[PDB]
Amino acid sequence: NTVNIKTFDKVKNAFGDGLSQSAEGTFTFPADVTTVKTIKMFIKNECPNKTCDEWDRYANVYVKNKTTGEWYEIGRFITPYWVGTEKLPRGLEIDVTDFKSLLSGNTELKIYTETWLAKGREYSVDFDIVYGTPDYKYSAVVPVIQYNKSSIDGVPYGKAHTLGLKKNIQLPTNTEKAYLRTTISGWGHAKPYDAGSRGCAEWCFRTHTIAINNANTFQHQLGALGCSANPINNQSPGNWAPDRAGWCPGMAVPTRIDVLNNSLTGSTFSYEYKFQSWTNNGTNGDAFYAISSFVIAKSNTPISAPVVTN
């Protein structure tokens, strides 16, 4: 079984006086998610005849955690230059199965675009829920860190001292499978440039590390994705083809999945996101990393949300 749920219908994120960069709404999702195998989120950006903010703007979607009243980023993308997602049949696709526990019953969603023009961007969002026999009937998800309000509200990169990326995580004793879900994209053309005149953090290729209990465990390489091969190839005269570090205009920001070893099940461990070292000399602007990292706990027996603590 595959149920399609329609959620935002030509909603506009715009900037200027009786307008907003974000839109919200409440939608009804089926209540039972125990047999949900996959949930695909589709984002359609309609921008016919240059009627939208022609820049490659940062955008993201959130689902509200009813109990805590906190917004969780389920997906982000960079809008294409000058056009919408027309070359793509169903729009940008992002797997959001990790958030099935929050995508049930009356769910409030939020979509934001860092647009600075009144014409902004218009979107239609729908979800495909595929029912079946999942490998794990239950899942729980909680954020470890969230500095993703916009491209320039991320974590400053290259500053003398930085903090706010070390946390402690306690996984439920019945966790059968656990993993981290991270989405990271950078902004800026700050100096000193890397070879090839690549400023940070939009252009400079880096490899960040996540340390579990002080041991370097996962590496996140923000390298070339092959922007020139983008299906949305009608973006000229915008600078669409050059490879940025870990993202391309008119494409979803990749979701990075790192599987935790089961020796962490039932125990509290430390998590630290370590940026590859670099110092901003401050002569050519700022550099930021917009980042969200989530811990997902799965089991075939009802499970409570992992505890994240400083």
Keywords:
monomer, 310 residues, mainly beta, Jelly Rolls, 2 domains, 6-stranded antiparallel beta sheet, 5-stranded antiparallel beta sheet
Q: Would you write up a description of this structure?
A:
- The protein is mainly β and 310 residues long.
- The protein has two domains: 1-135, Jelly Rolls (Sandwich), CATH 2.60.120; 136-310, Sandwich (Jelly Rolls), CATH 2.60.120.230.
- The protein has strands at residues 2-13, 22-29, 36-45, 58-65, 70-78, 92-95, 105-113, 121-131, 138-147, 155-156, 166-171, 177-194, 198-201, 206-212, 215-222, 251-252, 256-259, 267-274, 287-299, 307-309.
- The strands form four sheets. Strands 9, 10, 12, 13, 17 and 19 form a six-stranded antiparallel β-sheet that branches. Strands 2-7-4-5-16 form a five-stranded antiparallel β-sheet, with no helix packed on it.
- The radius of gyration is 20 Å and the shape is globular.
- The N and C termini lie far apart (42 Å).
CATH topology of the largest domain: Jelly Rolls
Distance between the amino and carboxyl termini: 42 Å
CATH architecture of the largest domain: Sandwich
- Structural class of the helices, strands and pairings? mainly beta
Order of helices and strands: EEEEEEEEEEEEEEEEEEEE
Secondary structure: helix percent: under 10%
Q: Count every beta strand, where a strand is a DSSP E run of 2 or more residues.
A: 20
What is the number of independent domains?
2
* CATH class placement of the largest domain: Mainly Beta
- Could you say which overall geometry the principal axes of the C-alpha atoms support? globular
Radius of gyration: 20 Å
Sheet with the most strands?
Answer: 6 strands, antiparallel
Task: Classify the beta-strand content into a percent band.
Answer: over 45%
